[PDB]
Amino acid sequence: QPLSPEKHEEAEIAAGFLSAMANPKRLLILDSLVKEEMAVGALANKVGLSQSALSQHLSKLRAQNLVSTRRDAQTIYYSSSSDSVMKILGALSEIYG
């Protein structure tokens, strides 16, 4: 008998989360930021993205509450403590390690 709507939107929510990290540059980003804070320019040069490209990706990450931000004058420092994230990265490294 079909699935109840409750496991439809829990699936929806889980899927929104995954879609948030289901992209190569975005995974590079989450890995680097889960293990150290850094400025956006440094990040763009680390993961090989133009500044605008990277800003958009980060916007998607913020959209799912997967990163936080800190301001030092002109510069913005990104980092991550959503451990949903690092459960997924853990699983992933287990898989390809």
Added chain:
Amino acid sequence: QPLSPEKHEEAEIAAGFLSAMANPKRLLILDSLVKEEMAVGALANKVGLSQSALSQHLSKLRAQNLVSTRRDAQTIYYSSSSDSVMKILGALSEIYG
């Protein structure tokens, strides 16, 4: 210093993997298949998907080698024994209760 080209593609491979299961109905599907054989039609009625839509989702799953199958006459029984699949499922359950 930038990230080496290799973490660009292990990130791409992981990301392909994740994209394959980054869709609500595709997680309902994966769970259900993660262990019980059932018919393509049966699946379609459990996750509320047309016979055609579902066949396409299952193809996207096959694309990443996430499901196995056996044939009983006309009927096709899908299952999943990809452990990658089910550890990401583990992470998900850990995250959401």
Added chain:
DNA sequence: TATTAGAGAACCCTGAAGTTAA
């Protein structure tokens, strides 16, 4: 820095046509 618009491609449906086995 974040934001926008645009191109080109991928996504995910619907509903018609193909394939395979009884």
Added chain:
DNA sequence: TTAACTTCAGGGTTCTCTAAT
């Protein structure tokens, strides 16, 4: 022919880049 699937064809929606003289 019928049944269970799959694929094709289409179109609306969503991604992710570049350009911003």
